[PDB]
From Swiss-Prot, chain A:
The chain holds residues 74 to 434 of 434 of the full protein. It is found in: Cytoplasm; Nucleus. Belongs to the AAA ATPase family. It comes from the Eukaryota. Keywords: Acetylation, ATP-binding, Cytoplasm, Nucleotide-binding, Nucleus, Phosphoprotein, Proteasome. This is 26S proteasome regulatory subunit 6A. N-acetylated by NAT1. The modification Phosphotyrosine is found at residue 80. The keyword Acetylation applies. ATP binds at residues 122-129. GO terms for cellular component: cytoplasm; nucleus; proteasome complex; proteasome regulatory particle, base subcomplex. The 26S proteasome is involved in the ATP-dependent degradation of ubiquitinated proteins. The regulatory (or ATPase) complex confers ATP dependency and substrate specificity to the 26S complex. GO terms for molecular function: ATP binding; ATP hydrolysis activity; proteasome-activating activity.
From Swiss-Prot, chain C:
GO terms for biological process: positive regulation of protein catabolic process; positive regulation of RNA polymerase II transcription preinitiation complex assembly; proteasome regulatory particle assembly; proteasome-mediated ubiquitin-dependent protein catabolic process; ubiquitin-dependent protein catabolic process. It comes from Saccharomyces cerevisiae (strain ATCC 204508 / S288c) (Baker's yeast). GO terms for molecular function: ATP binding; ATP hydrolysis activity; proteasome-activating activity; ubiquitin protein ligase binding. The gene is RPT1. This is 26S proteasome regulatory subunit 7 homolog. Keywords: ATP-binding, Cytoplasm, Nucleotide-binding, Nucleus, Phosphoprotein, Proteasome.
UniProtKB/Swiss-Prot annotation, chain D:
Belongs to the peptidase C19 family. USP14/UBP6 subfamily. Residues 7-365 form the USP domain. GO terms for cellular component: proteasome complex; proteasome regulatory particle. Residues 249-254 have a biased composition (Basic and acidic residues). The modification Phosphothreonine is found at residue 257. It comes from the Eukaryota. The chain holds residues 103 to 499 of 499 of the full protein. GO terms for molecular function: cysteine-type deubiquitinase activity; proteasome binding. This is Ubiquitin carboxyl-terminal hydrolase 6. The lineage of its organism: Eukaryota, Fungi, Dikarya, Ascomycota, Saccharomycotina.
Swiss-Prot record, chain E:
Belongs to the AAA ATPase family. The 26S proteasome is involved in the ATP-dependent degradation of ubiquitinated proteins. The regulatory (or ATPase) complex confers ATP dependency and substrate specificity to the 26S complex. The chain holds residues 264 to 427 of 437 of the full protein. This is 26S proteasome subunit RPT4. N-acetylated by NAT1. It comes from the Eukaryota.
Length: 334, 76, 359, 367, 164, 109
């Protein structure tokens, strides 16, 4: 019965055995078969008497709090029928990760190893996050958002352990995408003598890679890192078992904007006359997120006008107003 | 005949009874499949709380009727 | 009088309290960041024993417990930053923040100008005012109202005053985080504050989170760190994530302030971060006039003032400068000992203010 | 200066269950009026009740209590009423002070007595009729529809999943050779006064003892139950609701001593209120039954709260909405009466050991 | 202390130090935040070395990407004396590694590794592996577990172009 | 803002006026705030303003501010950002609150 004493061991006349309790105290018990050999395994809670100091029973594994840096979302709700117009970024993404996961057996018979990883850089504001979750849904991966600043602990090692726990759960839950918010805290270590300070970040990264190539032939876990733009890092783009693949996001084109507009126009009322292709010619160098902000502005015209839908005009006027990154309205010069 | 008792969890369960059964008998049948002690059961039907010595026929509780089972929040 | 009534209150309070202590002694015994019931005799699993700490652990997977109503024990209790969870004995509030920030419920500064800031106010009105007054309008259209606003030109242009005024009208909280303070030089500390601000934000939804100065923090990211852009980008990049990552739109507002426009990144510009760009930069002649007219109503004045004339002497202003002309004009009068303001005084205040601004 | 605070009942020791219940009943205008105008010469409606005389005495003693509340007697001691109630319903004479009691049980018995004395005139204001659909879970061609079930309150079932009153009300409308049958109620007639019971008290199996569910369950100030109605009845009630909403919106658009001026303003405010009642009433449906809600919408007018471990411990209070100023609420903590704001009422949804809503009273929109 | 004692018992041993900047920095900027923990570590390694205990059946191998966040102590002979650098390959090195990688692999056709080598300029084993899988990608598409000579020529070139 | 010179006229005016209003003259060394590490100054500044408003009316005398008298168009690194964080903190507190004489400032240079 709880309250009970657990012990977190990290240790792998007659025979002596050392137990490490989480009260950070080493204790003597014998391993003469009064205490069975199968009640010790590292990394694991095992159940020790309070004042008799002896392993009666073994309890499930745990080291720190469970899912401490990790968000768990079993299977996103998104699809590539929800996220669409991003089609080329779907092709790259599918060839690097999805096909090694699906056809794992095929990679084994072929007798190459599987790449497990990609690195993405290039602009979001198009549904980069949204695409990542789509891939997650499609492959039937568990989506794990792991935030790179949480590891980066000011305390000793604990961060290193967190990287290992991530792999451990990821391998149990397989298929899995480990989706890494930032790249600034498993990276940005520079090449100067300030790479000293930035140790915690070199160590979290190194381990995650060492661990992937450790298991490169089997495609169970995927690693994806995301940023606006590529940062200084240790070499890792040169190797299948690391994050081999380096995937670029470009900007949309007329076909892509128009699909993105048709996805937008299901959600919200329209007067069902609005021509995406025509509006798409009228917007120059727009991204997906910005076509979504035009829909909001088109509705702000509508809000003032006393309309509950939007006509073509209502959208044209929406574009003229700011979306804050690019807006087509230029006609001034005398 | 078969009647219904909406338990505390919001669920309806069924009970097999006779127009001659008393509210004490019914409460015993409820204890059997729900596990609540009769002395803790308050049964409502048609806005009336059912008294222990009366019978289902007294209240005109026919087949498929639904009784509402409630406990008590003592205070004063 | 005042003394007898204070004692009478103590006596009354105390008796209830003494009884209550003994009851607490017999059982051997909400914000919170881990739960810690340090014993648990009362209460897969069919009973609670939950205690989240490095040095020991008691783990039960199953919360609830409408009888006994759990809690008690070695008291920090509720939901966990590990999700074992005190689910629902005495109010948890989703991992609720013990790290504070400055809250100003209903900030009081109503409507400094309503004329000559005419368009800029109206932008605020669509985004912020109307979606609190009617959520159903917005819903019916199917649009989601601007998540974030960027306010530009110099800060303290009466930028603050206007923002506060709409917040009063709607009865909404100002949540002030000042960019400059965050700056620590210890591992991860700033970004940690940011996560807890948003968790706290979701709980408190209907709030304008004011982020002072993006010149301060998140000013570059093109460096790939430097020790002082590396915590600073860490905090920054984390803060964006949270925003596109969803917080409710039409409740929680984030307002950014900036003096200079060279700090901005493509990351910052994009929707789900900034959608609005509201001006508080340079107004018109007709406009300068309205803001002058507006501050001098409250004042007594003796006749011969035309606002147009006062406006004329400004070759370029910001809202800050205008506020300085009315208030400075009043000072020349007080030195001479006066309650009234004159055309001469207003001219004298324009000449001083503009010339100091130069260079 | 001139506005007098309502008065409350002194607690005789564990009799706040009665006090809170009497304030809630007093707030129900039609009930208050029929009690205040009761003449013992009128007898009872149901003289089939063998204990007729004691039910009449309960009403007489309630009328005396109500006369003292109406005519503000800074404190009312309901001693004779308690004695009378105990004679009729000996459960309330249990000791261990007398034992604390479940306000729901008192409410139920008072309703029984008022139905005996007043008959349909009382009970029709509270009646909810159901259409019940009974389907064999094992066979969806075996379908039976009954129209004869009714009650005088709705139960809000609370489990660990329950977060809003609606959740619990919906669960309360459903329940489950021999087979398992689903029994599904939809409302075919709504009352002008709608009583909602939060099912908080229960028999704990683990301890063989009375307990209480503390879970937070948010209730609305304006309740719309269109989704609980039969399709046919919803169509009727929604049509009414949409006309009433139009009136509400139009409403929201629009030498004497100091004492005399206050009394004139009260008279003015009552007249203005009556003129708006008449405007809503223009839109009531032609064949509305006496006591029936015109629409599917209600406003909250009263809340009976409890704080404590179970129904035989702790304390009951009432929170009552002011009859003219809809933003104003009174807290009746036995004889200690105070004014509170809407935020305090919202906090009564519960969570932990806090005072929380147990019984809610709603009155139809436009009444 | 434990790591060294156990090395002596369990000698021969490789002690492999993964990215040395954290136990062998230089200082952040000459300043300190946590870069004194780094100094506490670093003095202990220099002490074992300088000591009466001598390295010869316990070998220590340090690894780091850059030598520009190694301490000057280490760069001085007698705490490291052997410094192996990772070079550009020969034409000969590339051939062997292409042949080895495609030996475990299933293929139609004898492969001319010699072309493949020309199509690189100094690919070490990791770079060569990316080329292998690349060929394999057109084979998953061509619905096969085999690869042509033809795939292999295209594959080495696409990997070269996308980096150095 | 008073500009003149120490012991010549700047200081004299400040002693004289502060005493006349019978407020606590609370003397801050501008340059020493100057602490050259990311954490020290903006807090120091916040802590000043806080205690002043509490125990009002109070004089925040900032002696010889010369070194956060720069503004920059873009901020980078620690070496430009530190300076700018301290400058911005003063600017925001002023812009953030308004007081008719819970806090009075004399700035000196």
């Amino acid at each position: 019965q709880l309250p009970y004493l657990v012990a977190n061991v990290v240790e792998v006349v007659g025979k002596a055995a050392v137990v490490k309790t989480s009260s950070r105290q080493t204790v003597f018990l014998p391993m003469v078969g009064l205490v069975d050999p199968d009640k010790l395994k590292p990394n694991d809670l095992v159940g020790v008497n309070k004042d008799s100091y002896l392993i009666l029973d073994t309890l499930p594994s745990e080291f720190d709090s469970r899912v401490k840096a990790m968000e768990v979302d079993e299977k996103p709700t998104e699809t590539y029928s929800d996220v669409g117009g991003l089609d080329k970024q779907i092709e790259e993404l599918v060839e690097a990760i999805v096909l090694p996961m699906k056809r794992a057996d095929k990679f084994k018979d072929m007798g190459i190893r599987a790449p497990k990883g990609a690195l993405m850089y290039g602009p979001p504001g198009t549904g980069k996050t949204l695409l990542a979750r789509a891939c997650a849904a499609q492959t039937n991966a568990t989506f794990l958002k792991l935030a790179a600043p949480q590891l980066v602990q000011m305390y000793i090692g604990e961060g290193a352990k967190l990287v290992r726990d991530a792999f451990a759960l990821a391998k149990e839950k397989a298929p899995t995408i480990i989706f890494i918010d930032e790249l600034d805290a498993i990276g940005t270590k520079r090449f100067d003598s300030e790479k000293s300070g930035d140790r915690e970040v070199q160590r979290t990264m190194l381990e995650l890679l060492n661990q992937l190539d450790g298991f490169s032939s089997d495609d169970r876990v995927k690693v994806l890192a995301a940023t606006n733009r590529v940062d200084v890092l240790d070499p890792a783009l040169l190797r299948s078992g690391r994050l081999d693949r380096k995937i670029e996001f470009p900007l949309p084109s007329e076909d892509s904007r128009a699909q993105i507009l048709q996805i937008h126009s299901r959600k919200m009322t329209t007067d069902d006359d609005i021509n995406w292709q025509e509006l798409a010619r009228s917007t120059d160098e727009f991204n997906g997120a910005q076509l979504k902000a035009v829909t909001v502005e088109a509705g702000m015209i509508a809000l003032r006008n006393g309309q509950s839908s939007v006509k073509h005009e209502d959208f044209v006027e929406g574009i003229s107003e700011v979306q804050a990154r690019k807006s087509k309205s230029v006609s001034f010069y005398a | 005949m078969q009647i219904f008792v909406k338990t505390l969890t919001g669920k309806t369960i069924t009970l097999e009874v006779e127009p001659s059964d008393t509210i004490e008998n019914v409460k015993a049948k409820i204890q059997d499949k729900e596990g609540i002690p009769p002395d803790q059961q308050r049964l409502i039907f048609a806005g009336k709380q059912l008294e222990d010595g009366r019978t289902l026929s007294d209240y005109n509780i026919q087949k498929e009727s639904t009784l509402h089972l409630v406990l008590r929040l003592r205070g004063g | 009088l005042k003394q007898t009534e204070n004692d009478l209150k103590d006596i009354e309070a105390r008796i209830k309290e003494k009884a209550g202590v003994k009851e607490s002694d017999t059982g051997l015994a909400h914000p919170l960041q881990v739960a810690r019931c340090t014993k648990i005799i009362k209460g897969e699993d069919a009973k609670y024993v939950i205690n989240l700490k490095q040095i020991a652990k008691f783990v039960v997977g199953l919360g609830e417990r409408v009888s006994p109503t759990d809690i008690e024990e070695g008291m920090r209790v509720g939901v966990d930053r590990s999700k074992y969870n005190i689910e629902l004995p005495l109010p948890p509030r989703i991992d609720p923040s013990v790290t504070m920030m400055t809250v100003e419920e209903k900030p009081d500064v109503t409507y400094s100008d309503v004329g000559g800031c005419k368009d800029q106010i109206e932008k605020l009105r669509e985004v912020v005012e109307l979606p609190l007054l009617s959520p159903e309008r917005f819903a019916t259209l199917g649009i989601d109202p601007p998540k974030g606003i960027l306010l530009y030109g110099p800060p303290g242009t009466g930028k603050t005053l206007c923002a506060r005024a709409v917040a009063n009208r709607t009865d909404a909280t100002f949540i002030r985080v000042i960019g400059s303070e965050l700056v620590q030089k210890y591992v991860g500390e700033g970004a940690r504050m940011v996560r807890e601000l948003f968790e706290m934000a979701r709980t408190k939804k209907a709030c304008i989170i004011f982020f002072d100065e993006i010149d301060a923090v998140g000013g570059a990211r093109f460096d790939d760190g430097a020790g002082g852009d590396n915590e600073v980008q860490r905090t920054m990049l984390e803060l964006i994530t949270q925003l596109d990552g969803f917080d409710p739109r039409g409740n929680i507002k984030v307002m950014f302030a900036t003096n200079r426009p060279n700090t901005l990144d493509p990351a910052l510009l994009r929707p789900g971060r900034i959608d609005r760009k509201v001006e508080f930069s340079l107004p018109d002649l007709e406009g300068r006039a309205n803001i002058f007219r507006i501050h001098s109503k409250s004042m007594s004045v003796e006749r011969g003032i035309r606002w147009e004339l006062i406006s004329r002497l400004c070759p370029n202003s910001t809202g800050a400068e205008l506020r300085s002309v009315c208030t400075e004009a009043g000072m020349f009068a007080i030195r001479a000992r006066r309650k009234v303001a004159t055309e001469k005084d207003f001219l004298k205040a324009v000449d001083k203010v503009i010339s100091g601004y130069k260079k | 200066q001139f506005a007098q605070l309502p008065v409350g009942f002194k607690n005789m020791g564990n009799t706040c269950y009665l006090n809170a219940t009497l304030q809630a009943l007093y707030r129900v205008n039609d009930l208050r009026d029929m009690i205040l105008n009761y003449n013992p010469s009128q007898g009872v409606s149901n003289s089939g009740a063998q204990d007729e005389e004691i039910h009449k005495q309960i009403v007489i003693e309630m009328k005396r209590c109500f006369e003292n509340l109406q005519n503000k007697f800074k404190s009312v001691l309901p001693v004779v009423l308690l004695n009378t109630l105990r004679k009729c319903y000996p459960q309330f004479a249990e000791r261990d002070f007398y034992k604390q009691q479940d306000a729901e049980e008192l409410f139920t018995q008072l309703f029984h007595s008022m139905s005996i004395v007043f008959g349909d005139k009382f009970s029709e204001d509270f009646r909810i009729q159901f259409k019940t659909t009974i389907k064999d879970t094992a066979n969806d061609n075996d379908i039976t529809v009954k129209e004869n079930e009714s009650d005088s309150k709705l139960q809000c079932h609370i489990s660990g999943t329950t977060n809003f009153m609606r959740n619990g009300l919906l669960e309360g409308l459903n329940e489950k050779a021999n087979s398992i049958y689903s029994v599904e109620k939809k409302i075919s007639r709504l009352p002008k006064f709608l009583t909602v019971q939060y099912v908080r008290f229960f028999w704990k199996r683990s301890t063989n003892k009375k307990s209480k569910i503390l879970r937070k369950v948010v209730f609305p100030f304006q309740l719309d139950v269109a989704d609980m109605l039969t399709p046919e009845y919803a169509a009727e009630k929604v049509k009414v609701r949409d006309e009433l909403r139009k009136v509400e919106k139009e409403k929201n658009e629009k030498v004497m001593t100091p004492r005399e001026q206050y009394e004139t303003q009260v008279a003015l405010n009552e007249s203005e209120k009556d003129q708006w009642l008449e405007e809503y009433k223009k839109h009531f449906p032609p064949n509305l039954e006496k006591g029936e809600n015109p629409s599917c919408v209600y406003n909250l007018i009263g809340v009976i709260t409890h704080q404590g471990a179970n129904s035989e411990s702790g304390h009951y209070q009432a929170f009552i909405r002011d009859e003219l100023d809809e933003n104003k609420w009174y807290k009746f903590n036995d004889d200690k009466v105070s004014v509170v704001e809407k935020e305090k009422i919202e906090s009564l949804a519960g969570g932990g050991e806090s005072d929380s809503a147990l019984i809610l009273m709603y009155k139809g929109f436009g009444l | 202390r434990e790591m060294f004692a156990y090395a002596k018992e369990h000698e021969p041993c490789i002690i492999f130090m993964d990215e040395v900047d954290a136990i062998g920095g230089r200082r952040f900027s000459e300043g300190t935040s946590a870069d004194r923990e780094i100094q506490r570590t670093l003095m202990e390694l220099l002490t074992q070395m300088d000591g009466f205990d001598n390295l010869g059946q316990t070998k220590i191998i340090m690894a780091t990407n850059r030598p520009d966040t190694l301490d000057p102590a280490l760069l001085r002979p007698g705490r490291l004396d052997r410094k192996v650098e990772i070079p550009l390959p020969n034409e000969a090195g590339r051939l062997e590694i292409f042949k080895i990688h495609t030996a475990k692999v299933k293929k139609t056709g004898e492969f001319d590794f010699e072309a493949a080598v020309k199509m690189s300029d100094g690919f070490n084993g990791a770079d060569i592996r990316n080329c292998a899988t690349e060929a394999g990608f057109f084979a998953i598409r061509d619905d096969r577990d085999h690869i042509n000579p033809d795939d292999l020529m295209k594959a080495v070139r696409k990997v070269a172009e996308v980096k150095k | 803002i008073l500009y003149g010179a120490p012991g010549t006229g700047k200081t004299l005016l400040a002693k004289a006026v502060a005493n006349q209003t019978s407020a606590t003259f609370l003397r801050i060394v501008g340059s020493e705030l100057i602490q050259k590490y990311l954490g020290d100054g903006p807090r120091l500044c916040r802590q000043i303003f806080k205690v002043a408003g509490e125990n009002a009316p109070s004089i925040v005398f900032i002696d010889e501010i010369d070194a956060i008298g720069t503004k920059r168009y873009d901020s980078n690194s620690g070496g430009e950002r530190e300076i700018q964080r301290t400058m911005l903190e003063l600017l925001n507190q002023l812009d953030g609150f308004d007081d008719r004489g819970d806090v009075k400032v004399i700035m000196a240079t």
